[PDB]
Design a protein around this ligand. Sequence first.
Ligand SMILES: O=C([O-])CC(=O)C(=O)O
Ligand SMILES: [Mn+2]
Ligand SMILES: [Zn+2]
Length: 444
Amino acid sequence: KDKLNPPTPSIYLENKRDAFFPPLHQFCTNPKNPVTVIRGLAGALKLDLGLFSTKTLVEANNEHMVEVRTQLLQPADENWDPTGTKKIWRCESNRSHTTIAKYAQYQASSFQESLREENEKRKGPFKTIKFGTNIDLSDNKKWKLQLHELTKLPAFARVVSAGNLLTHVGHTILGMNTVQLYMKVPGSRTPGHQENNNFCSVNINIGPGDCEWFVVPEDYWGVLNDFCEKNNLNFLMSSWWPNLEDLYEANVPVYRFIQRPGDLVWINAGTVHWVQAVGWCNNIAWNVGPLTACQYKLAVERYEWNKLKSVKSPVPMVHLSWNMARNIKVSDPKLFEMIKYCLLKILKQYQTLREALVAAGKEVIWHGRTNDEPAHYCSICEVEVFNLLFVTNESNTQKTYIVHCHDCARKTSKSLENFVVLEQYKMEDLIQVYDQFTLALSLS
Ligand SMILES: O=C([O-])CC(=O)C(=O)O
Ligand SMILES: [Mn+2]
Ligand SMILES: [Zn+2]
């Protein structure tokens, strides 16, 4: 079908007015648009992209860490097995570390070398390339001018804003509410994925070269999960590059487009995507969580799915849900009912566990909390642990407070005789927050 190759939802900005025009924000967060390409964004705002050039980055922090992926240079939109016999989903992508200064040297010599081949005149085997990915730009003292430039964006796309759920988590989540940088040569690939806990994402191409994007709507993700499983791949943990002919056969629509320097790509919640550099360029990216029923719903879904698959959730959705109820006036009835439902479930589970402990003669110790203290995860299984913390007698005395969930503590110590139970919130107080959480009136 032509319907299997749909057009790209696109918007063309000329000036600051187009960029701050409220219908732009509405268009991006509309569930019907899996992706929005905002063309000419940096030009419209007069953003100085030179602050993110490789020359500038070397001058700023030349010894900064870079994660290196070593890959094969594949043709166009395909992925072949090493021998060049057939197209397969598994990608080769070996990891190591380098510095900005050393990768910059490779990026430049790569370009010079291709200029020479181009002046040498006239199925693989395939060449090896290196991709510099996941560069951490969270430190405001090291990247002051870079981070300040991104505050020039319209509020809905900023790393920090009052309407961003990730701003309401209350603590740093590396690479989600902090910026990541990518340094590339032609063929550099980001393999197939959904964002952490299905949060929206923003990506800006610094240039000077182009990137090519491939996008599949959220509601087809189960089909791609099946494909991975049938090819001995973990959808969440493995590196895979979809065979477009497999997808077409399975009637999965694929959005395909070019991202030019200064173009901003908005990836909506749960949208599946993979990317390759066409030329030499850098990119920057981070996550955003719009206050919509759609975003909250997909975030909760992936949170629960990650438990089944034994994968850690970077976003602590229990911690976040209480913060929303404490600090955010919710005027959408669907969104309000979703949050209320979740809090009620947390509250009942917490009540059940607490009374089981008390009925069995186990002391609950009042421990309390520091404000802005991050959520806790189980030191063994990495599930989020809220309020009732399980700590060993020894870690307690030493004041190390190494957190365990109830299930892991039990599996170790049958009657919890090796543990103490710490409580961070009084029950009356959580009941109060829940009770005072009501639907606000908005006429919008
Ligand atoms: O390689 C990049 O530009 C980062 C990327 O694909 C993404 O935003 O998922
Ligand atoms: Mn992404
Ligand atoms: Zn555990």
